[PDB]
Amino acid sequence: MDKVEELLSKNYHLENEVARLKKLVDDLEDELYAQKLKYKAISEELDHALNDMTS
Amino acid sequence: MDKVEELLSKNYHLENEVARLKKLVDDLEDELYAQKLKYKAISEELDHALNDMT
């Protein structure tokens, strides 16, 4: 029928969205952790900075 | 009546999945942004720092 026609259509668009969101969510997960490691490393040279500047 | 019912159920689960993923993306974008505001605020401090001694 037609209620089936539109449902197939709506489900097609929905499945695509879900695909794009899952990938986006993964990309952000990585970007965010990469971010945290870059932040943690930014301090590593710093721990040696104020630490070696003190004594 | 058979597939029309299957279709509706799939559709329902998809709409909820989209809404949940959408909420997840928004949270990650916030965390990420917030992290950039600290990364930045910090950098601006080295400015007064590395050159402060130059």
Swiss-Prot record, chain A:
Function: Master transcriptional regulator that mediates the response to amino acid starvation. Binds variations of the DNA sequence 5'-ATGA[CG]TCAT-3' in canonical nucleosome-depleted 5'-positioned promoters, and also within coding sequences and 3' non-coding regions. During nutrient starvation (low or poor amino acid, carbon or purine sources), it activates genes required for amino acid biosynthesis and transport, autophagy, cofactor biosynthesis and transport, mitochondrial transport, and additional downstream transcription factors.
PTM comment text: Phosphorylated by the cyclin-CDK PCL5-PHO85.
Subunit-level organization: Homodimer. Each subunit binds overlapping and non-identical half-sites that flank the central CG base-pair in the pseudo-palindromic motif 5'-ATGA[CG]TCAT-3'. Interacts with the mediator tail; the interaction with GAL11/MED15 is direct. Interacts with the SAGA histone acetyltransferase complex. Interacts with the SWI/SNF chromatin remodeling complex.
Organismal lineage: Eukaryota, Fungi, Dikarya, Ascomycota, Saccharomycotina
Gene deletion effect: Abolishes recruitment of the mediator complex to the upstream activating sequence (UAS) of amino-acid starvation responsive genes. Decreases RNA level of genes involved in amino acid biosynthesis and cofactor biosynthesis during amino acid starvation or methyl methanesulfonate stress. Growth dependent on amino acid supplementation. Sensitive to amino acid starvation. Sensitive to purine starvation. Decreases cellular glycogen levels during glucose starvation.
Family of the protein in this entry: Belongs to the bZIP family. GCN4 subfamily.
The gene coding this protein: GCN4
Region of interest (Leucine-zipper), ranges: 2-21
Domain notes for this protein: Residues 89 to 100 and 106 to 125 define the N-terminal activation domain (NTAD) and the central acidic activation domain (CAAD) respectively, which can function independently to promote high-level transcription of the target genes.
Subcellular location per the Swiss-Prot or TrEMBL entry: Nucleus
Protein known as: General control transcription factor GCN4
Induction: Translation is induced by amino acid or purine starvation, or during growth in low or poor carbon sources. Translational repression during nutrient-rich conditions is dependent on four uORFs (upstream open reading frames) present in the 5'-UTR of the mRNA; these promote ribosome dissociation. Translational induction occurs in conditions reducing translation machinery efficiency, leading to ribosomes scanning over the uORFs, and increased translation of the mRNA. The rapid translational induction is followed by transcriptional induction at later time-points, independently of the uORF sequences.
Curated annotation (Swiss-Prot), chain B:
Location of the protein in the cell: Nucleus
Post-translational changes noted in the entry: Phosphorylated by the cyclin-CDK PCL5-PHO85.
Induction entry: Translation is induced by amino acid or purine starvation, or during growth in low or poor carbon sources. Translational repression during nutrient-rich conditions is dependent on four uORFs (upstream open reading frames) present in the 5'-UTR of the mRNA; these promote ribosome dissociation. Translational induction occurs in conditions reducing translation machinery efficiency, leading to ribosomes scanning over the uORFs, and increased translation of the mRNA. The rapid translational induction is followed by transcriptional induction at later time-points, independently of the uORF sequences.
Reported phenotype of the disruption mutant: Abolishes recruitment of the mediator complex to the upstream activating sequence (UAS) of amino-acid starvation responsive genes. Decreases RNA level of genes involved in amino acid biosynthesis and cofactor biosynthesis during amino acid starvation or methyl methanesulfonate stress. Growth dependent on amino acid supplementation. Sensitive to amino acid starvation. Sensitive to purine starvation. Decreases cellular glycogen levels during glucose starvation.
Region (Leucine-zipper): 2-21
Top-level taxon in the UniProt lineage: Eukaryota
Its job: Master transcriptional regulator that mediates the response to amino acid starvation. Binds variations of the DNA sequence 5'-ATGA[CG]TCAT-3' in canonical nucleosome-depleted 5'-positioned promoters, and also within coding sequences and 3' non-coding regions. During nutrient starvation (low or poor amino acid, carbon or purine sources), it activates genes required for amino acid biosynthesis and transport, autophagy, cofactor biosynthesis and transport, mitochondrial transport, and additional downstream transcription factors.
Quaternary structure and interacting proteins, as annotated: Homodimer. Each subunit binds overlapping and non-identical half-sites that flank the central CG base-pair in the pseudo-palindromic motif 5'-ATGA[CG]TCAT-3'. Interacts with the mediator tail; the interaction with GAL11/MED15 is direct. Interacts with the SAGA histone acetyltransferase complex. Interacts with the SWI/SNF chromatin remodeling complex.
Free-text comment on this protein's domains from its UniProt entry: Residues 89 to 100 and 106 to 125 define the N-terminal activation domain (NTAD) and the central acidic activation domain (CAAD) respectively, which can function independently to promote high-level transcription of the target genes.
Family: Belongs to the bZIP family. GCN4 subfamily.
Protein name: General control transcription factor GCN4
Organism: Saccharomyces cerevisiae (strain ATCC 204508 / S288c)
